[PDB]
Amino acid sequence: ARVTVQDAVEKIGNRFDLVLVAARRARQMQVGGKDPLVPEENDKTTVIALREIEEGLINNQILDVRERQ
Amino acid sequence: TEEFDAIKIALASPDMIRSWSFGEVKKPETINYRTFKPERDGLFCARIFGPVKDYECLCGKYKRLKHRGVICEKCGVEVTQTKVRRERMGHIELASPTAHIWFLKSLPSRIGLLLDMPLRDIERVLYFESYVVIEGGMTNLERQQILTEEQYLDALEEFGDEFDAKMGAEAIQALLKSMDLEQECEQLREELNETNSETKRKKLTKRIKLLEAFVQSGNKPEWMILTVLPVLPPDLRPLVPLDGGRFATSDLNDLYRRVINRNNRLKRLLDLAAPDIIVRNEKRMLQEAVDALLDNGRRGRAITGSNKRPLKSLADMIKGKQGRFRQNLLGKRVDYSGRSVITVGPYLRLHQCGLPKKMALELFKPFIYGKLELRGLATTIKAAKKMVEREEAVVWDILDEVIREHPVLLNRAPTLHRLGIQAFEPVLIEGKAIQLHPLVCAAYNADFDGDQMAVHVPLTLEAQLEARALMMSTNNILSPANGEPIIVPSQDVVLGLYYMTRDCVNAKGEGMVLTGPKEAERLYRSGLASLHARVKVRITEYEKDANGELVAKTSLKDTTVGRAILWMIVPKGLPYSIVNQALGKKAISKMLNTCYRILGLKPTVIFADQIMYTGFAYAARSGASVGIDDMVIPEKKHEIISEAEAEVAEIQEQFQSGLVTAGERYNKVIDIWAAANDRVSKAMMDNLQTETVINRDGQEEKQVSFNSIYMMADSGARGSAAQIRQLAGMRGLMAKPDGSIIETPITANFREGLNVLQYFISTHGARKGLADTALKTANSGYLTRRLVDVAQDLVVTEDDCGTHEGIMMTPVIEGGDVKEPLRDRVLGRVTAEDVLKPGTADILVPRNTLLHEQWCDLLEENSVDAVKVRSVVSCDTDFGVCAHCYGRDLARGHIINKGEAIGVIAAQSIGEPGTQLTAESSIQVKNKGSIKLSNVKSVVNSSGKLVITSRNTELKLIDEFGRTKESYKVPYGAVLAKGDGEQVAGGETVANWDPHTMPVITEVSGFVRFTDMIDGQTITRQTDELTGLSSLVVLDSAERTAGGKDLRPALKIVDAQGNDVLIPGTDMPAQYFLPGKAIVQLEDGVQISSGDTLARIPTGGLPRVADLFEARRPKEPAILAEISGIVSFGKETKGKRRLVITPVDGSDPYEEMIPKWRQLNVFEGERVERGDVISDGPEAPHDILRLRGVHAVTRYIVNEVQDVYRLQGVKINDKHIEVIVRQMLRKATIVNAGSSDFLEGEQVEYSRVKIANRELEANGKVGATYSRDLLGITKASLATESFISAASFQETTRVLTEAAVAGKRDELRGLKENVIVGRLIPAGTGYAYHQDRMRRRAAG
Amino acid sequence: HARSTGSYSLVTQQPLGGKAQFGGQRFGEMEVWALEAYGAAYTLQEMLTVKSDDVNGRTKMYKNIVDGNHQMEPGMPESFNVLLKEIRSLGINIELEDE
């Protein structure tokens, strides 16, 4: 289990819209419109989206560019 | 559903009501009672309101969902979902315009005062007993003239024309439409400019405000009278058919049927042109029916058909507890939740929790079904239920698979603070008990004695993400109240670690040299060396001294095996020194503190877990127990007891002879018994503490004992010195019911045996204690509820307001020493401006910087004493606070994030800890330093003393390196020894004064001359013989004799020749008005020396905190000065003596009444400063705020609350109290004019926005100067801006009517409004959502 | 004791209280304040509508879970809409604004 989200909050310092972007990503992941960019280790889609956020691949702007594309 | 905000309320116009309505309900029938099909227009009609059952017509021709717009040819009902029958409204067209009961009969009658005509008259008019002449043209009669029958008759016969009068709501509407708003408003403004009298000016200002509210909102008065009346959807007032041909109906059905009946009868009577009397009666009857519908109870209380119970009107459904809001959105039972008993489970990780199989299956049932169907193990859902009720291996595998990362919420019944709910990852276990991680118990206040815990499951995805990010246990290690760690090891862990680190003089493996910890473990685990034995070990510590690089330093330290074994866990960054000591509770706590501050979160978590495991393991290996011989009775107890008994016997016998009162004997016995108790306690502690005299190789030695009970005491695991005393010493003195202390103490202890009396006494004690705790808890709960209620809406909205204002914060040095240092007091606050070294142009801190540990450390090496820091109270932001003014402090370390609701966290942090709260002759410098006098003006006399002539004189202490250690307040008349500059040795007497005596000191010499000092009228000469004793008494205002009440005796100080000698440097003729109780001992005939004595002048805890927060005037307030300058007396003896403060510069006319009993501390001819004490006693916050201003009152509140809280040793950060105070003073009162009504209580927010407007306008205004007001939290909360939040709990009818008439607009801005409306709170995760909607307006 | 879903009460459609009948835990006002101290807005949202009182909401959430997706569909609580109709039933114009 991912015991700390400290690096994800260091990516976006509000610590609140972090939850929103991670929820949007994990909702695009659960209802299978999209695919994970990280090799999953039997995590559920919430911890997958946090693991993706902490690695710098996804934020709000990447979501907006990919959605309009 | 639209995404909205800003809920608007106003009078409904008849055309808008026509807009909402879908049809007219013409007949009152509902259903045929024979065939249960509904009738035509009726009250229940399918073609108007909707189909009764989903997607199927009445006659049963069309039943399929395939049809969605077809309208059955037989029954004209369209096929749609029956839910629409729940929202469609109807309407009834009334023939006679009818009044709205709420806007007329509501206690402040808005029709009444709008027309400036009393309510009695309106009632007189409405019931048709008398007429009123409304605009009777060019005759001799006014507009609110009451007319009798035959006076109306003779008027009509005389005046055929130019006579217009009418009756009822139509007449009232006529009066309202023809009223000229602006002409009356301007006339009223002129009148107010001409009129000066309190009550009429108040009624006029209320009325003008009402008119203004109408002219801005745009509501026209005529809408208060109803013409069309809407009718509620049928399903909300159902008419259900009971089994057995009978029907059950809501009362609204009865009221609607009666209203429709009476309306139709009135229609026919109108069509028949019936006489006026009958139509008037019918219109009245329709009034009762309608107003009973709207609000039943303001009339003859129209009861229902054949039931004697009063029927429920609309207002009853809305208003009141049982109806709606107060109960509807307040405290419900939720789903997917369970509850059970908690258990230890040490093997768990900090971020996990043991969950029973069966509970997990029950909770996650629907997840199980979904996943089972996804995997194809089950064709359909019923097969999933059958497979779950068999419970095959596949079910447990799927349950295991779904559970991996899904977090659950744990809650414990009294959720005092936000750490009462936390999320954990579950691990499936056998059994029916929940397993809870030990470290978090302290946070929950959980105990394993039958306490139970509740477990909730977050359903939606956003909830899951929120739980894992914000609420998870590992993310909450710091308490939101104060910064210190919460998860510190509690009792077993600390005991084990204590055992591990303590060393022994001689053991197995003394003095061998080890190459590292690994062979230390080899040695200990193989039994070739004792777990604690002094040894030389080579160790490599790491230090990140560079920019994040670790440098290995490797050397030989002298330690124990145990300390090395412990060192194995310790993360890289920490110095070895940390573990080298005894390692008790405090040591472990500060270890965790340093580990967190240096390394960060994750290493701290893992290190805490490691500490737990090793502590538990080695505590178990230790084998610590408690035997009867472990508590050693001190050998010299019996002697002490016999001696104290002999002493009490001697004092009692010497009492029976009668040389000492009973009270004195009581005091003596109590004090000697206390001394004996302290003696025995100290002897027992000496015996037990260091008694192990064990031998090394040769001679012997002694060391800190290994007595198991002593280790439990010293480690801080359990027990304090007091309980050790209670076990092995005498258990001290006891208190009887009233609080008085029994003369004979309890000499026995629990190791020995008590006897009946002593036991009985302790029983009383324990009973009283427990009852106290009970009532304390009740009072706490009540206090915290008020706090959280009042401060809920405050949210951090802006990043930085950009103000330069701030409060100068100093370390509070109460008397002897520095109770609380600066560093902790300033940590995490941003600075208001750069502070300079003791040498100018040496900037130490740039403009606003967050003061983290490094800056704080920097400040201690230098000598900064006081720092101006931005405070929340002075923050400039409108409708919330800015991040910078607040600071950092959180469960996390960084500056506050925009959006967090700090009000609620502050209220909880101040409330929850509130459940464990129940001579001065000479100054003595404690530490060697220079003495410095502040705020004083002394005059050296002949004796060579620095005579103190100021009542507000302070004596602080500068140390070697420029810091104020000690501070004392030196009163007027205290003999001084050392002046300024002198270095004072340790504990040397620097000042002297009489404790129960304040002498009045003369500055010059000469003969005492009597002025207005007449003998007999106001003073009574009782004088003694030659030696110069007297009893001349200059009495105070209360105690002055009956003849000398107004005659004020005075003493002018003249010299031997006669001329009044003048005070040095000033020309003032010294005319000393002798104050109250001026005992003139030295009679006339003795050359006065400089310093002759002229006049001798002789709760806490929860209720105190609640009282500070409710701002209650403490019945004896001290009095202050407004301006400086010569005070003077005035018109004498009216029953309260008058004092008029005369400013040397400013205007005179400030009079203050003074009761007779009050004694004055200042002389008439004295130089007062503003806000100096005039009478002694507790000051009410209002005066301090008004005179000294905001920062003074906020400092006052913070110091008195923080005193109570620290007295119990509970640490709370000041920011929360500051936030509360800021919420307290939201309101101001206008003193100047220009845009307001010159006196209205208005919130500071509206004042700030209007001043910003005015001063932005180039012409603008002179501008509105204001004065702050302080309101108590209960009333202050009651004065809530939001109409929704007000309606949430007070009289609903009143606020709803007020907001409806005022056209008020609610942006909801708060927590409770958003809850009520069922949308996302604007705090935290939903802030962004709302932020999005704010971006959504005025965008593309 | 634990419950996932079960019988609800007659008049106010909240789950029964008790142990004999399944019965849910009492989410009191103090717990609301605790959650509010955190930024937990969505948890409160489900707690107020989807978890207890909203009939259509609870069945929709059941169906969504059964389908193997874990989302939810937001909006104004119907009880709130009922409130609008009841206040509007008086002579009071209360409008849902838009921008």
Ligand SMILES: [Mg+2]
């Ligand atoms: Mg317990």
Ligand SMILES: [Zn+2]
């Ligand atoms: Zn049909």
Ligand SMILES: [Zn+2]
């Ligand atoms: Zn600010």
